[PDB]
Design a protein around this ligand. Sequence first.
Ligand SMILES: [Ca+2]
Ligand SMILES: [Ca+2]
Ligand SMILES: [Ca+2]
Ligand SMILES: [Ca+2]
Ligand SMILES: [Ca+2]
Ligand SMILES: [Cl-]
Lengths: 25, 25, 25, 25
Amino acid sequence: SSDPLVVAASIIGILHLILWILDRL
Amino acid sequence: SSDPLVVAASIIGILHLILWILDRL
Amino acid sequence: SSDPLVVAASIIGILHLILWILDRL
Amino acid sequence: SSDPLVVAASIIGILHLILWILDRL
Ligand SMILES: [Ca+2]
Ligand SMILES: [Ca+2]
Ligand SMILES: [Ca+2]
Ligand SMILES: [Ca+2]
Ligand SMILES: [Ca+2]
Ligand SMILES: [Cl-]
């Protein structure tokens, strides 16, 4: 388990990557 | 809970994203 | 130890960096 | 505390940011 802040940051990071890929495609 | 280093990195990462968005807007 | 989500995010982040470097080289 | 992999990723992430800033300056 991780600090809730770190979990939040990790989710944002993944969603950032997904949105970027979808934008490029 | 997380290593303090990881908490620090996550905060920096979020603030990086926010500043980028504000810059673009 | 970390949340599995955070471990996943960290792996993706590293692989993102590696792919970027290989692309540039 | 965090998974060693996550600590590694966080260090790389910070160093990435620092190098980028120094490059721009
Ligand atoms: Ca932990
Ligand atoms: Ca806390
Ligand atoms: Ca430590
Ligand atoms: Ca969980
Ligand atoms: Ca482990
Ligand atoms: Cl963690």
